[PDB]
């Protein structure tokens, strides 16, 4: 498979009420495994998946160190950004970042990421070539000039090319029994009368991992885009995901309709129908 290690961070200023709130999380694929929340008395980077709990005291010390250094810089960045945009001292602002590596089926760096946003808008991102930056506006252009001056792109690429992948491989091995197991969706179709002549068919995909899935309806083999509702894939709370798609159909014509589900855990695309 094509696995990923990614860290996400949110920093929210609280002006007049103390320090910002920093909440950082880490993921392998769609599975969270660490967090850091600045709102504890002595905040630490903490495990959130069983297969990382085995890392020794030194790992947790270093990842806590890393988190706190990041928070120090995010603090400064929130200050800087308020000045860049000539914003009031009052009022809360949000800074977000994300970074990580994708491991290619060939065992090498397939893709790297390093992106930031301010108040919900793209700010600066590392180009896909991992050599240069893309700045959203004139404020981010100032950040770009500083990061070129410190040759940050090259330094971060070295992290992506080496340790990011090293740690990702180690996680994938230590959690192989869950991380490397594609849980197929359990699927079924339910039937809900809407009137004396129409009914809703709802096609369910439950308990699947990873999150990527497709679920569509067809009528006589043609894609159905009318009379439908699909919900966005959603977490079940146990590490797996759910999705459903519903179509309103004429009563007595249910067997013309087929649900189509594709997922890494299904060897073939699955075609399903309502089964009274």
């Amino acid at each position: 498979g094509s696995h990923s290690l990614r860290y996400f961070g949110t920093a929210v200023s609280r002006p007049g009420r103390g320090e910002p709130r920093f909440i950082y999380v880490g993921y392998v694929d769609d599975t969270q495994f660490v967090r850091f929340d600045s709102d504890a008395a002595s905040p630490r980077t903490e495990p959130r998946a069983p297969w990382v709990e085995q890392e020794g005291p030194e790992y947790w010390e270093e990842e806590t160190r890393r988190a706190k250094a990041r928070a120090q810089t995010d603090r400064a960045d929130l200050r800087t950004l308020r000045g860049y945009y000539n914003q009031s001292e009052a009022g809360s602002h949000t800074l977000q970042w994300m970074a990580g590596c994708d491991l290619g089926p060939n065992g090498r760096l397939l893709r790297g990421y390093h992106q930031s946003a301010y108040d919900g808008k793209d700010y600066i991102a590392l180009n896909e070539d991992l050599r240069s930056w893309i700045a959203a506006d004139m404020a981010a252009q100032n950040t770009q000039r500083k990061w070129e001056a410190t040759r940050y792109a090259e330094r971060f690429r070295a992290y992506l090319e080496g340790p990011c992948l090293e740690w990702l491989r180690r996680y994938l091995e230590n959690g192989k029994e869950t991380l490397q197991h594609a849980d197929p969706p359990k699927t079924h179709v339910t039937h809900h009368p809407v009137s004396d002549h129409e009914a809703t068919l709802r096609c369910w995909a439950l308990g699947f991992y990873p999150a990527e899935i497709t679920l569509t309806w067809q009528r006589d083999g043609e894609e159905q885009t009318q009379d439908i509702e699909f919900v966005e894939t959603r977490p079940a709370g146990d590490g797996t995901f759910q999705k459903w798609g519903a179509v309103v159909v004429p009563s007595g014509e249910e067997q013309r309709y087929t649900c189509h589900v594709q997922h890494e855990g299904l060897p073939e695309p699955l075609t399903l129908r309502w089964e009274p």
């Binding site: 810089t73 960045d77 800087t80 390093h114 930031s116 700010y123 500083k146």
Partner: peptide
């Protein structure tokens, strides 16, 4: 990064 090391400072925006």
């Amino acid at each position: 990064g090391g400072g925006i």
